[model samples]
Target: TIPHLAIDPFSLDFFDDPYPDQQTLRDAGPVVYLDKWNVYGVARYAEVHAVLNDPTTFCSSRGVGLSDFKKEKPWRPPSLILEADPPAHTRPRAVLSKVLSPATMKTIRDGFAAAADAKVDELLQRGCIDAIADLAEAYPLSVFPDAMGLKQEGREHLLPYAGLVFNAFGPPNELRQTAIERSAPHQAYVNEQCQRPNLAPGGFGACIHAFTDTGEITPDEAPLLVRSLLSAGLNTTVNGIGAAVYCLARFPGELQRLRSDPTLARNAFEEAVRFESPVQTFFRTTTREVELGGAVIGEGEKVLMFLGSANRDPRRWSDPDLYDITRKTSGHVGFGSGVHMCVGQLVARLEGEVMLSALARKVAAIDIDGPVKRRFNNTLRGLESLPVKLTPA
Candidate 1:
């Protein structure tokens, strides 16, 4: 008999602290039927990796959520890249790949480092800061919009709009409802920003529009691609940086390790991601009946992949819960794996690397000075407020 768990992964209770529930799901079986959501879940590292790599059997197109696009209308037009599979997914992925390619990353690397240094210097002047609001949120908001060639006027809409995208991945619940309510004004702003006219001439948004000229993707498709960047780009990095801040604050030894070797900034960032996944879970619909753990799962069933669980699975990492800066964290799914892996990950990494490196050079220690608050979402995990005192080296 297949193991079934009634726990609601989408509930606020689970969102606040998911480790125990995640362990329960992973220990239950390789494939557990989440009775509450009517979805199959895979929490072990091996199974989650298998599902991600074999998209042929575990497809992304029907919808990466409980709402199958074949049966129900999406809340909005689906992401041309994220909601697509194989042949259709190729071009948009390629276009985005080129936009975020190593060459493109190299072009902006020095500028990003400079921006990080400036932001760190500004925050250092204050001694004490809310790491989430001051460092994590402020740094990305300052740089990413200008990189996308977004106009400076209505830039505040970026975070809330991205928050809506992440929350929509879960079932219709209070978290999703509140995000929907808060995102209305920002929704209009995002759509307007995606238009070619609204995008600045030399940014990634404009570069995506350039693909229309090459006839690779239609003009109508251009905005949605830019929309994808706008949606997935900001919040993931914000949460990632927040996770790193939180992790380092709690583990001063790791912070000191990083300070001794500033080059470990990238490794520190990736380890924090492995330790505290920013994007927690994503669903994939089974395209055909498949046998797993001696039981058969029917075609078109929703399969939720617990990325956070996989990242910290003991089977994959020795001391999986520890935030160690030197650990090699290459295979962690803080960014999803396989063909549908995050296209904007390189950009996110660059942001994290630069900011952490700046801190390693300038700050001696990061200590939590007040209470920390967690931001709960159906899909993303992060800090809402992380008060800290930054001691100078």
Candidate 2:
């Protein structure tokens, strides 16, 4: 018999701190049925990996949420990449992959590194700050827009627009409803920013639009792909950077280790992604009757894959809960896996690595100076506030 866990996975209770429920879900079995949504769940590393890799059996073309695109309408036009499976997913992935290749990233690095150095200097000057707002939110919101060629006027709308996109991936609830109500203007602002005129020459957006000339993607499809970068570019890294700082603040020893070897900045963020798993959960609709672990799942079912749980599953990681920067976290599903893995990962890594590196180079210690606060969304997880004082090296 299949295991059944009767709980609203999206309830505020679960989001407050999901580890307790995450532990139970993995302990229950390889595959558990989530009663509240009547969806199956894969909380362990092996099964979650299996589902993401086998996209044909568990296709993403349908809405990657409770709302089946085949059955109901999406709140906005479905993303050309995030909401599209192969044939549809193939070219956008290739073209964007080409744009975000290592060569392109190499050119972006010095600029990112310089911005990171400047932000850390700002931290050193201030001495005390909110890690969530000052470092995490501020860093990405500052450079990523410039990286993407967005103008300066309405940059504040990025996070709100992102919240709505990720929140809509959940069931119809107050969280989704509230994001809907407040995001209208933010949504418009983001849309306007995605236009060609708003994008600066030689920036990521202009480069993606340039593909239209090469005939890789039509002009109509280019801005949507640019929107993909915008929506993905901000909050995930914002949460990812916040998640890393939260980990470092708690584990001063690892923080010291990073200070000793600033090269570990890359590992620090990778470990944080594994430890915290920012993009917590998303769904894949089963395309046909398929076997996952010992259970046979019926078609048209939404199966939520818990990246948060999968990264920490004891079966996959040794000392999974410990925040060790040196941990070989190669297989962690924090950035997801397979063809649909996060396209913005290198950019995310660049933002995280440089920020942590700059902190390691100049700051002696990151001492927590205020109470930590957690922010919850239906599909994302990060602290809302993390206050700390930096002792300069």
Candidate 3:
């Protein structure tokens, strides 16, 4: 028997911080239907991971969000990579995978590390820095675009353009409209980067165009795929870095643990990603009749997987709310599980590890000097401003 759920998950309150309600749902059962949204939900780690990995049972092609592509149109073309099922999703993913190899990643690591260190050094000199904007967003926006082989005419336009793409994944409310308005000025420039001439030689964006030339995918597919890397790549890494700094600021002891042994930096980033999953929720379609947590999810219904909730489920980890750096959080689903799992996670990890390790090396201590702000987006969970003062060692 499943416990009754009384809340409307789509309400504004739930969007603000869905964890408390997520706890209720997880405690209630493994899978439950939200009559309000007319979708099924999985709140536990095991169930969510199972749903994500089992593409046959949970279809991404139907849609990955409340806005069903069958009924409602996607603001942009549905992502071939994020929205396709296996056999179809495999081709583009294979092409992109080859571009982000270990050898390529290794070559970029030290330079990326140096960039983060330099940025941290600059922020510490300022005495009081809004770590999110100054340190976090600053570093990734530089490295990610460069690595993507993107050289835009009006580069300032990229971040907001990416923001709108993410917001469009949500309800077409004022937020979505605002994102559209923000991105309008740069729409033409956005189109231009997809052309063969705009390619940046060795970056991911260039590789995407190369794939198009090889008859792997269409010219139309190249831009959106590049846009996917551009859109999903920047904010997640930036927010993850800011959240880690914010978390460490609140827990001074953890900073000491990271400093005493620099090896902890990688795990520290993973823990932060788990604790506050930047990419909060992704949608899955319930295929036929499937039982999760003893509740049967009906066919063609939307099933939302709260990656953030699963990360903190007390059923899986003791004291799930606490941010413990020592915990084994590798499969935390912060990057989501399965084939559609975040394609750019390798780059995201590289950015976070580089920035965090740089701060740990030069800073004797780092602490929040003031209030931290939250930037609300339908899909992204991020801090607006994280104020910190890093004392240089």
Candidate 4:
């Protein structure tokens, strides 16, 4: 029998602070079965990387979550890009890669830089503000909509809908239920926004829908593909940026490093992703009988990859718990990996770079001003409120 653990990875307590259980899971073995959820767990760097890289063997088509697609209907339509295997995943991934390529992101860069500057300037004026609400959420809330050419009215639904999508990746528990009950209006709005008319011309959404005109994707498939973009583009980046700010506020030495050499902005963001993975965990279903970490898991079995733990795995990173912004963090799974390697990663990094770089140039000090509150979700890690005071340089 496989090493069995009964810890509840999906509970609110786990989300509040996951490191202890994550350590327990990693210590158990490279692969441990979570009897509570009846899914196998992979937490070590080597195994997690193997599982993600060998997606063909441990497939995504079965739903990247606790609920196996073979056993249950997904609460929402499965993501064409995120929850798909090679052939089905191929076309959409290519389309999005082209749509959000470095060239396209280049076009988006100057506007985002201006917005980051403007926001940082405003925050410096305020002097005291909640970093989560005022900067992390606000910046993306403002610009991504414009980038996507979305209307202003129902913009508030974005986070809730994004939260629902990430939460639903876990077992249907209290946290997931809570997000589900409140998500209908948000979901409907998101669905509506995915439609052609709701998207402004030349925005990412409109560009995605344009493919349908050439028979690349069906009209019906267009919105679902757009849905993938919405899920990929929003809360994760918000949380990733929020996590970086939190790391910097807490790790003053690293903050000074960033301040001394602002070029480290991108590296700092990458380090934060490694230190505090935003998209913490995602599961993959075994395509067939396979051996992993001395354990043999059967076909259709769900193997949950504790991405956060892997990022902090001692076997892979010395002083893995330390937040070293100068550390080489190229292989971190904060955005997952392989064919499903976060489509919005470039945009997220750009957002992180501009925001952190601006703060470094214009702010002398970043001090945590008040009580910090953690947000609970089954999958993503972030803060709900991170109050901070900025000293202008």
Candidate 5:
């Protein structure tokens, strides 16, 4: 049975302002069958966490995109880990996890921070800067390829391609068309780099290829895992940084709290993630008839979990919509939950915190110079333009 207030998931308005619709869906139940898209939706935190953690019940194998992988389409293959269930996902995930664990990641922090600090200081000194270009996009593209062991030949193509990779999942629409047209040339370059000999040593890409060599994952599966990181990594980190900066600049009180104590940089980034999640929505397929929030979900249905909405549910949070720096958000589903939790989160965090601290270190105050515009993608949330002027210390 279709629940009430069901939305057309493919509409531009829904993409423009999803929260209102999200609230409607949330109150409907934990699992509400949406008629427009002919699928289910998980709007609240508890059920979302359950879906994310319990991959066995809600599989990712159908293809995270609306285009089911069973049918041959223009879509790239899904990530080895993101698309795989336990035994199949374990080895590849473990190999990559070993590559980017806290200890190994710590080695790159100072270097990345130094690079980020220099760029932020330069942008602040320039007086007015588009945070998206000057800092957010600038920093990660500068560091991630090197960290991921990508070659210099077409290393610059990451942003647009990542934009396509995420948005192509929604529907066969204009945004997907635009992204594909823009990313066509770079796609081949990215796919070709998946082979072991091409990837630079000491980066995740090379290691993924190595895992393939060691029989950890099939050689064919190796590229998509690398592609997954590259696809999800490039734009999402940039947007998260832009979002955090925009949130801080828009909220002066939050900025001051960050300034007074630099440690708040980490907390502020996380809070901003809770405030506006980067990976906005992901799908999980239902395995059987199930009851959640007093509603029954039929078998073989897909559940679209709106993580951004769950973070803002008033039932679970105090001042759910307000940006609070002091809010204890440990359980927030920003990085997701359970085994599918983002393996590269520390990398995302280091990039965000360093960028925040870099700006906070050099700029005394920063605020919007004009209105900001959002970069729209079905699976990702981010800024296209965030105008601001900085007062440097």
Candidate 6:
């Protein structure tokens, strides 16, 4: 029989500190049933990866939240890609895939790289700063909006809107409720910006809207797709950058390793993702009855995949908890896996690599200057504040 872990993974306590419970969930069994949320869970690396990859059996279309879209009104319209299955998921996925292709990324790389360098230089002037507020959030919030050609006004709404979107994935709790309330105006702003006229002609937003000309998606569907990019673009990169900064601060040796080879910047970011997955968990409902780890999961049941736990699972990674920039982190589910893998990962990677690399060249060391505060969301893990004292080279 599968283990029953009655703990509420969505509670503030769980979000505040999840590693201990993560260990317990993984140790209990490959599959565990959460009585509080009444959901099944897959924590081991192999099973989590398997479930993410096998979307046919564990479909995402019913909705990726505890409140099944088929059974309840979604907080918002379902994502064309994230909340969809294959035939429906394919076209939008293809369009976005092309929009975010290496060529498109190349066009933005130099600009992003320059922005990173500029931010690093500015922070060096301060010497000691909150890496999260002053750097992580600040950097992405600056460039991504410009890249998308979004208006300068009301730009503050991005993070709050993203917070609400990710939190809505969990059960209706204070976190989700607060996000929904605070995000009302922000969400409206995001929707308004997704319109074609609001997007800059050469930016990613315009590029997504261009799909309508090819008849791949309707003119009406374009803005929602743009909304997908906007919501996904902000937090993931913010958290990824934050995770790297936190990892580098916690492990000076790794930072030193990065300094030795500035080329390790990309690996450092990837490893940080593996070491501390930002998008912690996502729900997928079983399309049909299935047996996992010798236990049966009923069809239509929501199963939560613990990506953070899976990344650290001892079965798949050696010395998993340690932050090693040299580790081959290709298989880690930090950006997720399979068809539903994050479409904006290249952009996220480019942002991280550029920022970390700039730091590697100009800063000799990163030391924790104050208490680090962890920000908890239903589906993301990142620092609220990471105080760091930078040592200039």
Query: What TM-score does structure 1 among the candidates reach?
Result: 0.98
lDDT of every model, 2 decimals: 0.91, 0.90, 0.80, 0.89, 0.80, 0.91
lDDT per residue (tens digit) for residues 350-372 in model 4: 99999989988988888999999
Residue pairs with clashing backbones, model 5: none
Clashing pairs in 2: none
TM-score of 5: 0.94
Candidate 1 — worst ten consecutive residues by lDDT sum?
210-219
Candidate 2: tens digits of C-alpha lDDT, residues 160-197: 89988989999889999999889889889888877888
Candidate with more favorable, higher TM-score: 2 or 3:
2
Candidate 6 lDDT tens digits, 260-352: 899999999999998889998999999899988899988889999999999999999999979999998888999889998989889999999
- Residue 42 in model 4: shift from native, Å? 0.5
RMSD per model, one decimal: 1.0, 1.0, 1.9, 1.1, 1.9, 0.9
Q: Tell me the tens digit of each residue's lDDT in model 5 across 61-133.
A: 7766665555545366567787776888888788678767887678889988898888877886688888888
Model 1, stretches more than 4 Å misplaced? none
Winner on TM-score (4 vs 6): 6
- Model 1 C-alpha RMSD vs. true structure (Å) is 1.0
Model 2: how far is 129 from its true place, Å? 0.6
Q: Per-residue error at 113 for model 1, in Å?
A: 0.5
**True-structure lDDT of candidate 4:** 0.89
Off by over 4 Å in 4: 213-215
Please give, for residues 329-348, the per-residue lDDT of candidate 1 as tens digits. 88998798999988888999
